[PDB]
Short mmCIF file of C-alpha atoms and ligand atoms in Angstrom, two decimals:
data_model
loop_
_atom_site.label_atom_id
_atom_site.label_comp_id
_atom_site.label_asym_id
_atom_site.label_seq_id
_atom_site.Cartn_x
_atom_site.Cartn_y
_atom_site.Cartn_z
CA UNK A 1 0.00 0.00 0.00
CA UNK A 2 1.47 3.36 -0.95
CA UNK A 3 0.69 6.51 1.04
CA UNK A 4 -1.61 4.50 3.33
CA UNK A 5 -1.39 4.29 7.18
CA UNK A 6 -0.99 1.19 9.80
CA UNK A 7 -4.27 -0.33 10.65
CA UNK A 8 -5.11 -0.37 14.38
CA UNK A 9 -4.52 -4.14 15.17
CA UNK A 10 -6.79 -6.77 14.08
CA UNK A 11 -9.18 -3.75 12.90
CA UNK A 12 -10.00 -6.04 9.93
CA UNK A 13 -10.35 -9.36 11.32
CA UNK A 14 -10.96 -11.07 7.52
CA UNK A 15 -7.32 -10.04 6.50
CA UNK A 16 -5.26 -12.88 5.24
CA UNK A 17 -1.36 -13.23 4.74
CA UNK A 18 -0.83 -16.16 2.26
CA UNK A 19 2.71 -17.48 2.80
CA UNK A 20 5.23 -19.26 1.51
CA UNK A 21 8.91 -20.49 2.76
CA UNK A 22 7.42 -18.36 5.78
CA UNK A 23 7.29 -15.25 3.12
CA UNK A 24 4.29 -13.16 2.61
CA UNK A 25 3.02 -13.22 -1.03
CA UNK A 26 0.39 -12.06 -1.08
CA UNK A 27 -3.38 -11.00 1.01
CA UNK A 28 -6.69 -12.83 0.94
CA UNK A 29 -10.24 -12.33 2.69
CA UNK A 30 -11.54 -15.31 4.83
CA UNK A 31 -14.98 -16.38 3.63
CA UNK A 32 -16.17 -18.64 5.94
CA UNK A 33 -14.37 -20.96 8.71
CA UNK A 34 -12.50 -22.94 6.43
CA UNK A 35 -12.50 -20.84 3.28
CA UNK A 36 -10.62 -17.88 2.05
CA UNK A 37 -10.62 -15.80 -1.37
CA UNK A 38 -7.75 -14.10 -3.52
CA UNK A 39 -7.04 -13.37 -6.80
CA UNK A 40 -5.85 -16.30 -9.20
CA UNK A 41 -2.89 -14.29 -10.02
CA UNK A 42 -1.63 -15.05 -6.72
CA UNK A 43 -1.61 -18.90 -7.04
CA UNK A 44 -1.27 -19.16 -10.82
CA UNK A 45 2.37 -20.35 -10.73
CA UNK A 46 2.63 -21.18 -7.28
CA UNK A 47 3.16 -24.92 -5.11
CA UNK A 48 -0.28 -24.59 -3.45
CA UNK A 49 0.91 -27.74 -1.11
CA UNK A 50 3.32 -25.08 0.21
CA UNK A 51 1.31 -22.55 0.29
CA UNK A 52 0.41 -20.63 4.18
CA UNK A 53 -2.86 -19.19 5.24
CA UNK A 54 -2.24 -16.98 8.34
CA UNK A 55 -5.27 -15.73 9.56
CA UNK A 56 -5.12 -13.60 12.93
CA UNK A 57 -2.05 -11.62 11.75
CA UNK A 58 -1.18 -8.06 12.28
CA UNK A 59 2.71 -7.65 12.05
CA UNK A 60 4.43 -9.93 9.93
CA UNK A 61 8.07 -9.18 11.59
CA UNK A 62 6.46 -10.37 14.52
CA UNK A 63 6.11 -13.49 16.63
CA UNK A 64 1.84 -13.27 17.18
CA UNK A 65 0.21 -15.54 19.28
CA UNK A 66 -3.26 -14.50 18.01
CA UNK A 67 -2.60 -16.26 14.59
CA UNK A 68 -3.94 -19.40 12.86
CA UNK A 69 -2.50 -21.33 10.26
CA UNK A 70 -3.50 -23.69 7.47
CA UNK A 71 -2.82 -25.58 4.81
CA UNK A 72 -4.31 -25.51 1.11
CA UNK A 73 -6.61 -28.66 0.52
CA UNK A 74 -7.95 -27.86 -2.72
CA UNK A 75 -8.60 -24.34 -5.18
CA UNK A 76 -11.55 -23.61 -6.82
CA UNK A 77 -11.05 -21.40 -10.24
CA UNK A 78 -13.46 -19.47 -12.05
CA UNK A 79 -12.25 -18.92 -15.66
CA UNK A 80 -9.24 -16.40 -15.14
CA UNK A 81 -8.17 -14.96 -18.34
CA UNK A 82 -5.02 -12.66 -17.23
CA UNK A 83 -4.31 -11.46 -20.88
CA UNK A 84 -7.50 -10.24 -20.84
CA UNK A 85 -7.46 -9.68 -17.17
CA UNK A 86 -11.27 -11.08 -16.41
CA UNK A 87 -11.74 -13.48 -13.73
CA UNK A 88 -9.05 -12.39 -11.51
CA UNK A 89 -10.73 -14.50 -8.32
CA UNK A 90 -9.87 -17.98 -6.82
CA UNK A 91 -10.86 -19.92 -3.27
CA UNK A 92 -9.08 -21.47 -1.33
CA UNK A 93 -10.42 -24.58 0.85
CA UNK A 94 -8.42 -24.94 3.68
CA UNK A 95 -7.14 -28.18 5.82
CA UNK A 96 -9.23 -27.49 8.81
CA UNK A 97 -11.82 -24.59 10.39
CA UNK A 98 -10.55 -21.45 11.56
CA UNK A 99 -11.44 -20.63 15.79
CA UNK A 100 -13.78 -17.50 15.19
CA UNK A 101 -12.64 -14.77 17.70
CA UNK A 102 -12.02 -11.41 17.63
CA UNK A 103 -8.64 -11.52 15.35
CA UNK A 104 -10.32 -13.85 13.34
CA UNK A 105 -13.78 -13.26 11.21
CA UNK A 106 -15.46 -14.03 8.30
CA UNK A 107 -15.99 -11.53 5.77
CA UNK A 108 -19.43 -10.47 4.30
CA UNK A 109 -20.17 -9.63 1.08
CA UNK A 110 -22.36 -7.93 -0.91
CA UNK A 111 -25.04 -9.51 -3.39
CA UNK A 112 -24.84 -11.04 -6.56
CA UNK A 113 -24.60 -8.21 -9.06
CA UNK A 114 -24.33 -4.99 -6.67
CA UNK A 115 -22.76 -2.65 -8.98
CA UNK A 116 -20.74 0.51 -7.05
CA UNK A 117 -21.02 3.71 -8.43
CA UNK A 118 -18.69 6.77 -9.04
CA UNK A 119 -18.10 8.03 -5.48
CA UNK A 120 -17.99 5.60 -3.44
CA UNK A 121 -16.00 5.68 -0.11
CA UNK A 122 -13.51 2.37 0.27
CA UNK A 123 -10.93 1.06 2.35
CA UNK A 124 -8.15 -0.77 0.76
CA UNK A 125 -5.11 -2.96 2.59
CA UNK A 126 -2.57 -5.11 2.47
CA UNK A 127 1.12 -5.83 3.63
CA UNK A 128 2.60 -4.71 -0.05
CA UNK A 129 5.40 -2.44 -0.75
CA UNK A 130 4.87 0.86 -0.04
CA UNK A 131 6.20 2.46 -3.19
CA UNK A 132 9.58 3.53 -4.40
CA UNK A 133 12.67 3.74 -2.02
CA UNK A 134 10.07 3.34 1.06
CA UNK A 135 10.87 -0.74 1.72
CA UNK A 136 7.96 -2.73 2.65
CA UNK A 137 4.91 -2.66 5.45
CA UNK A 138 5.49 -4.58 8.41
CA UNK A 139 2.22 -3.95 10.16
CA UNK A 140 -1.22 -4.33 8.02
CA UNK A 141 -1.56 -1.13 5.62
CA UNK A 142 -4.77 0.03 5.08
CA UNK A 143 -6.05 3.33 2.53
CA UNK A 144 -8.83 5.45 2.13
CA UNK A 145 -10.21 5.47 -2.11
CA UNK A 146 -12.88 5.93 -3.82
CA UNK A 147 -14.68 4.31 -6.78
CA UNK A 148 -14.62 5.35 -9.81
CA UNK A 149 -16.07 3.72 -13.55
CA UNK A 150 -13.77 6.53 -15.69
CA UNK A 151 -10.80 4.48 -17.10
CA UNK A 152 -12.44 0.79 -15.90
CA UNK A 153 -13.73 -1.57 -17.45
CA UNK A 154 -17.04 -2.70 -16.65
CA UNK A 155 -15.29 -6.09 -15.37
CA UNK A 156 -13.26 -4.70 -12.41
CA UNK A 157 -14.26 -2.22 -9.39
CA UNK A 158 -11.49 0.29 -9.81
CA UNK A 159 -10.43 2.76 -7.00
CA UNK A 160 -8.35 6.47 -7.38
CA UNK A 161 -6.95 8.36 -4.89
CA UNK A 162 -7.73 11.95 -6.32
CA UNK A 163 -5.12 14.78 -5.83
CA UNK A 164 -1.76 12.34 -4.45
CA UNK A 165 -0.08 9.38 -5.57
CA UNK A 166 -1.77 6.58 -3.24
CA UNK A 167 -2.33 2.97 -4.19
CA UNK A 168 -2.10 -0.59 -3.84
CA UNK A 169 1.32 -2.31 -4.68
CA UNK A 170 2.73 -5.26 -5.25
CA UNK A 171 2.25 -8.04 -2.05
CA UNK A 172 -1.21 -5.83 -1.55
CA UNK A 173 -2.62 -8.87 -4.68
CA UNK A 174 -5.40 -10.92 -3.50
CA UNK A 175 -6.67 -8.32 -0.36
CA UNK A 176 -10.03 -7.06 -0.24
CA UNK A 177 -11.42 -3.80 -1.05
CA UNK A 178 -14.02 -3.19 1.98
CA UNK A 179 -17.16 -0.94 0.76
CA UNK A 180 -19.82 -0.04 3.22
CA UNK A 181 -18.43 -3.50 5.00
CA UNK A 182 -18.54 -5.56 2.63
CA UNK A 183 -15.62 -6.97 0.42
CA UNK A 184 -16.45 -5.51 -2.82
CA UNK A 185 -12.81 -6.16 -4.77
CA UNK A 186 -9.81 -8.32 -4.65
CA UNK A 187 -6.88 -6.77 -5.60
CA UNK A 188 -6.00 -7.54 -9.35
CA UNK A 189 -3.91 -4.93 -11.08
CA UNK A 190 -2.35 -1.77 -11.44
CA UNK A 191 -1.95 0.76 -14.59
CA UNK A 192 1.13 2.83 -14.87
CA UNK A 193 2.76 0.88 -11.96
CA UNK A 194 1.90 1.41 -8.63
CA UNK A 195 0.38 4.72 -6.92
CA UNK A 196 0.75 6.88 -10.79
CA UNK A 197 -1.94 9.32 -9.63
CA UNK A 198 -2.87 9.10 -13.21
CA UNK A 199 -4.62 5.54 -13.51
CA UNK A 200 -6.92 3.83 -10.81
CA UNK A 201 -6.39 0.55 -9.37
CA UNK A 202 -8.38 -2.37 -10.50
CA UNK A 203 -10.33 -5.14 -8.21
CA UNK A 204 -11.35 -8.34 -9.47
CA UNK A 205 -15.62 -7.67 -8.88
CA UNK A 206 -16.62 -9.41 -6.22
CA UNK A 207 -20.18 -9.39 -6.75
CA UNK A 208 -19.95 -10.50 -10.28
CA UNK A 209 -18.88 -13.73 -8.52
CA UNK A 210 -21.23 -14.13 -5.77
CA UNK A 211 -23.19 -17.12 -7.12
CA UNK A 212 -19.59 -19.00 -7.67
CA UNK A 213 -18.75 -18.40 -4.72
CA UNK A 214 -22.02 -19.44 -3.02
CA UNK A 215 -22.23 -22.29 -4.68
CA UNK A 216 -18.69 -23.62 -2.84
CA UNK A 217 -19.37 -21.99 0.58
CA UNK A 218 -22.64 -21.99 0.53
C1 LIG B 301 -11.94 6.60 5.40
O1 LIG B 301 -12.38 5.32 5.70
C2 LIG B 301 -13.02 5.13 6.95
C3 LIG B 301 -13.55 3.69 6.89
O2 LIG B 301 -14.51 3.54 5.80
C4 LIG B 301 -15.71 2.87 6.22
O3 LIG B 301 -15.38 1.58 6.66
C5 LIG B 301 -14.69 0.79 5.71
C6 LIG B 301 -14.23 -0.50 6.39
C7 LIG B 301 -15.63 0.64 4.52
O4 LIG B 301 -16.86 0.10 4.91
C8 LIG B 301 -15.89 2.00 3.94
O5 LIG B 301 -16.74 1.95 2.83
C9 LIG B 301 -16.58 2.87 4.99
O6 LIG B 301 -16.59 4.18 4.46
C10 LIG B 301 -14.15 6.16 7.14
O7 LIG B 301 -14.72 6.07 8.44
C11 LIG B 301 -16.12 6.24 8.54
O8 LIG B 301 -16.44 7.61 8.68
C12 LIG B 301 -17.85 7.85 9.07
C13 LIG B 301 -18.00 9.33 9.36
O9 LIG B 301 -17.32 10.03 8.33
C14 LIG B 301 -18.33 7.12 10.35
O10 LIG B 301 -19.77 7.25 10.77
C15 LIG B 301 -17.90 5.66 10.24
O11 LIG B 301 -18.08 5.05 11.55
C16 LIG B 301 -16.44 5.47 9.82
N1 LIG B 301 -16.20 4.02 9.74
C17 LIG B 301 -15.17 3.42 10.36
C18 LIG B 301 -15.00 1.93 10.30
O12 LIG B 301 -14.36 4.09 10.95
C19 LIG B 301 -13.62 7.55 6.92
O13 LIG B 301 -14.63 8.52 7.03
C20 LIG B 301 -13.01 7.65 5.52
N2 LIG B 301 -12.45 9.00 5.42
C21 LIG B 301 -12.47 9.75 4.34
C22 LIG B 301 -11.90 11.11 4.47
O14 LIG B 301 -12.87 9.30 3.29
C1 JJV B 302 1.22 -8.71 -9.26
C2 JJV B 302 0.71 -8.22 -10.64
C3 JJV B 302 0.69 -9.07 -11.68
C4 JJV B 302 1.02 -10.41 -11.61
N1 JJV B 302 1.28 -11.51 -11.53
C5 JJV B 302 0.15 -8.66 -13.03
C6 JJV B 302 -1.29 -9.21 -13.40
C7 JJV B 302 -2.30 -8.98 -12.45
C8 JJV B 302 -3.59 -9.38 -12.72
C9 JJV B 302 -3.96 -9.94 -13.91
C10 JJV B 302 -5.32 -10.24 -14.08
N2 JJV B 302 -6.41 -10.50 -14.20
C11 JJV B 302 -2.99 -10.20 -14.88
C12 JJV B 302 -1.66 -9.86 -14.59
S1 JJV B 302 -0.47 -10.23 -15.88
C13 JJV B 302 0.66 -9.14 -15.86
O1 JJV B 302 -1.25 -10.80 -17.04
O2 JJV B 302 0.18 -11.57 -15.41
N3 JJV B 302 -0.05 -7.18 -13.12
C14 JJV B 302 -0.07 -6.40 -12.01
O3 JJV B 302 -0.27 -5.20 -12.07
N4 JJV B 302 0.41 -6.91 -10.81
C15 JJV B 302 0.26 -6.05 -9.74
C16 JJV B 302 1.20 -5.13 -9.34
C17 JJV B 302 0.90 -4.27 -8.32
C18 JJV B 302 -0.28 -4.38 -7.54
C19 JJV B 302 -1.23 -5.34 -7.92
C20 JJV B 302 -2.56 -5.44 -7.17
F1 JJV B 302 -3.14 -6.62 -7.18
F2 JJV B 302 -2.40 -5.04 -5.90
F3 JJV B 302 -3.45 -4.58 -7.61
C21 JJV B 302 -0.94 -6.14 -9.04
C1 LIG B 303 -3.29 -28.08 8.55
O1 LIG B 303 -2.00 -27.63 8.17
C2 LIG B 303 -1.25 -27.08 9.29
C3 LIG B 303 -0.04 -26.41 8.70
O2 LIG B 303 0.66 -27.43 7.97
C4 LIG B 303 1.97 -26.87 7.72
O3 LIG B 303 1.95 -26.02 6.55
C5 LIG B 303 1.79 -26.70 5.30
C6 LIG B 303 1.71 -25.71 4.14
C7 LIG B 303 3.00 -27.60 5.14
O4 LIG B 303 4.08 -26.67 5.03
C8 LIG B 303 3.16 -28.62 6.30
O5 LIG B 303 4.46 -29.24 6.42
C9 LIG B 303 3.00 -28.00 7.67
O6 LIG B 303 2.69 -29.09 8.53
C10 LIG B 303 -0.90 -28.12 10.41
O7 LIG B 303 0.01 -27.59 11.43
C11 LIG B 303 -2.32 -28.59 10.87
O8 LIG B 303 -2.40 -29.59 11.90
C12 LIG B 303 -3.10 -29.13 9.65
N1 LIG B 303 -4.44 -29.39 10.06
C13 LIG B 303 -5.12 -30.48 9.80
C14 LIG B 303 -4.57 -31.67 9.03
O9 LIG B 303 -6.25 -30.45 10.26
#
């Protein structure tokens, strides 16, 4: 996240850290117990058996008790096309059920369809890089944006940060884009890198996905 600030501890208790070689790679939004959701860009190439789910996390530098871990057991795709960036969504089943406490919720989201208009007041986050010769978050980022449908296609939810360069980056991939308090976006891509102040940042569209998603978690 670039030009964002530390979230308050385990403010956002649906954050995810997906791991690997015990590196963060990227964020994801738990769904239900023993579900969470990214963006397929984030486990296109990667050894899922490998993969890390740390739920319960807040700084990554850290040694944190409140954290749970888990294991992969299977991904569900939906059709992602990255050349023509559509689809940009995957779930992850894990190995067991997440303890539900107060570092460690289910997300809600919105309803099949529920289209955001210009305007809209968002919070973005994730532990990505926060921009150009200014390293790397340790503690959860999080960032104020707004919607916007100028420059987006009508298959993403795309954010802008009007009047500074502010942003998601890379490691910020597969975190949530929270909109009236419900996850709305997964973080997909980026036009003229990270934080231009020129191009907004796309979400995969949550709500185009709702039925998919339902029909896994229920
Ligand atoms: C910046 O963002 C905060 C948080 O946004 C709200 O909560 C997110 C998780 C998501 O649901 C967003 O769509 C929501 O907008 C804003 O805080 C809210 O501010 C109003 C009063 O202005 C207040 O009644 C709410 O309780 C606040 N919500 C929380 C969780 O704090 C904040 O206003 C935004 N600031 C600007 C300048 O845009
Ligand atoms: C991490 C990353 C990429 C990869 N892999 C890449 C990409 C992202 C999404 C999609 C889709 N759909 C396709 C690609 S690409 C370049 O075809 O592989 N393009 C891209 O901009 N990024 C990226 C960089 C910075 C932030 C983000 C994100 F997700 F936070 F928005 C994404
Ligand atoms: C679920 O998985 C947990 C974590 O497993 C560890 O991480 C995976 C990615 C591998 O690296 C593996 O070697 C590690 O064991 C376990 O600690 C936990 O008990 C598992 N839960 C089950 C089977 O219910």
């Amino acid at each position: 996240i670039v030009g964002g600030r530390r979230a308050r501890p385990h403010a956002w208790p649906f954050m995810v850290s997906l791991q690997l070689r015990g590196g963060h790679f990227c964020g994801a939004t738990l769904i239900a117990p023993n579900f969470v959701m990214s963006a397929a860009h984030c486990v296109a190439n990667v050894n899922v058996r490998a993969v890390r789910v740390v739920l319960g996390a807040h700084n990554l530098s850290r040694r944190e008790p409140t954290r749970q871990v888990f294991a992969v057991q299977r991904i569900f795709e939906n059709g992602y096309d990255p050349v023509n960036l559509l689809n940009d969504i995957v779930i992850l089943q894990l190995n067991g059920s997440a303890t539900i406490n107060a570092n460690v919720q289910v997300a809600q989201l919105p309803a099949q369809g529920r289209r955001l208009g210009n305007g809209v007041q968002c919070l973005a986050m994730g532990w990505g890089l926060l921009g150009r010769n200014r390293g790397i978050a340790s503690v959860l980022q999080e960032l104020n944006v707004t919607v916007v449908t100028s420059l987006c296609r009508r298959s993403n939810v795309c954010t802008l940060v009007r009047g500074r360069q502010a942003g998601v980056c890379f490691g910020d991939s597969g975190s949530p884009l929270v909109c009236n308090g419900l996850i709305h976006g997964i973080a997909s891509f980026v036009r003229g890198g990270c934080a231009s102040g020129l191009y907004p940042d796309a979400f995969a569209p949550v709500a185009q996905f709702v039925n998919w998603i339902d029909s896994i978690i229920q």
